């Protein structure tokens, strides 16, 4: 159940004339392609982005996408003309297409459409259909779009056959990048809490890859259950950043440590004690005026 391949399309329609479509492609949490509106061709963001496909096979798909992008734009504009009072610019459409890969040549495909930020339409089997909660007026556009047997046939091709095949090539060719292990670097800080005489201890953890990580404030072998893990934040070099906070009363700091478990570390956890020789020296280099 290892990997999700995602083609993400972002289409903005301001008015009857102005429009742009930009796309990005992801395998897991690594970016493989980008497609700007002003770019005629799909760009590779990795050396292995073409997968196992030949130059002829790639050019064939690229040509198909070029026709589609232009065709999508006008089709939406026509639907607005058709839908009239119901809908009207500005229009924001997000499209998420791809497949989830599994061990043993097993695959599931998907094509999801969001309208004005809300998930409204999916391609299922042989045709478009509304999802629960979708506005009732979508019934007509879906009927109209489902009358296009040609578009449907190519969608089915890309979903049933082209995704699973292409992704498998991507998984093989990008093996070294997908299986990379980058070591986390941890450092400590603190700020005053809203409560008087209380402090919030912050354990910063940066530069780790892959994403799964374990961070807890500790007093000896005792996990501090007041530890609040933050959100995973991306770094520019395709690594992750995370911080865990803990609320203590002034004086409680001594004896506490931030512990970090990560696959790149082996079995050798990073243990960072609050009062440490290194923390003291690193804090000296961190001083500022606020």
């Amino acid at each position, epitope marked *: 159940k290892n990997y999700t391949f995602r083609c993400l399309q972002m289409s903005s329609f301001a008015n009857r004339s102005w429009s742009r479509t930009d796309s990005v492609v992801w395998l897991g949490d690594l970016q493989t392609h980008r497609w700007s509106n002003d770019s005629a061709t799909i760009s590779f963001t990795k050396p292995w982005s073409q997968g196992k496909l030949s130059n002829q096979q790639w050019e064939k798909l690229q040509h198909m996408f070029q026709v589609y992008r232009v*065709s999508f734009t006008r089709d939406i504009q026509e639907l607005v003309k058709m839908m*009239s009072p119901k809908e009207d610019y500005p229009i924001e459409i997000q499209l998420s297409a791809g497949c989830e890969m599994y061990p043993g040549n097993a695959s599931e495909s998907f094509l999801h459409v969001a309208f004005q930020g809300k998930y409204v339409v999916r391609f299922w089997g042989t045709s478009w259909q509304t999802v629960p909660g979708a506005p009732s007026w979508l019934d007509l556009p879906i009927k*109209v779009l489902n009358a296009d047997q040609g578009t449907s046939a190519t969608v089915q091709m890309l979903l049933n056959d082209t995704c699973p095949l292409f992704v498998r090539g991507l998984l093989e060719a990008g093996k070294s990048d997908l299986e990379k292990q980058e070591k986390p670097v941890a450092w400590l800080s603190s700020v005053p809490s809203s409560a008087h005489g209380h402090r919030q201890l912050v354990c910063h953890v940066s530069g780790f890859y892959p994403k799964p990580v374990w961070v807890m404030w500790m007093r000896g072998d005792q996990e501090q259950q007041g530890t609040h893990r933050g959100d995973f934040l991306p770094n520019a070099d395709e690594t992750w950043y995370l911080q865990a906070t803990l609320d203590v009363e002034a004086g409680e700091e001594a004896g506490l440590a931030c512990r970090v478990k990560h696959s790149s570390l082996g079995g050798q956890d990073i243990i960072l004690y609050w009062g440490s020789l290194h923390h003291i020296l690193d804090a000296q280099k961190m001083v500022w005026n606020h």
Partner: T-cell receptor
Amino acid sequence: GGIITQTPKFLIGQEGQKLTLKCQQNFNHDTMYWYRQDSGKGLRLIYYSYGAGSTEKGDLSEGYDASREKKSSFSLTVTSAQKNEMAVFLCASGSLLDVREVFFGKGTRLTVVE
Amino acid sequence: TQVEQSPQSLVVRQGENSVLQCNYSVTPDNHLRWFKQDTGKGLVSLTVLVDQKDKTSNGRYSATLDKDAKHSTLHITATLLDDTATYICVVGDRGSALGRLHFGAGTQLIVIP
């Protein structure tokens, strides 16, 4: 199982006069079209409609206006008839759920007199 | 402009076979169809072609479509005097009613007895 009829079949125009062409259809078609046929060129879309009162500009909308009063009826107006203008106008209707189903009217021949 | 028909004018002896050509560059090319227009009249549907390599027939009319070559030929078998008309090739750019039709200038067929 029906007809699409344009009226009038022939139209006498005068320089600067406003002209009105009517097209009626009982195919139960939501989409209706107004084309212009010039010699040696090929049909060119003036206006089209998804229903009343949808009026959408085609590539040759300038100098014309259109109105869809109801589903069966789609009118085209010539805003200002040109001096020596001889023209042929063709109405068509199509099914919204079948792009291959399109029927055309018999045409309207316009001659603008001095 | 995007739909080109040749020849401009075809003269065929009665009883003989006529061949009419259409070349296009419209994309996508979902379907191509042929229309007959009598003088002082409208367009009458002859045949609709849909597949990558397609053959259709309708009475004495038959047509072929090659999408890779972007080329279509209309055939008229055993030409009668009533075949005298303009023949128009038309390409539709979508498989849905959101599409537009692209009209050829037409081929005048003249059938001499």
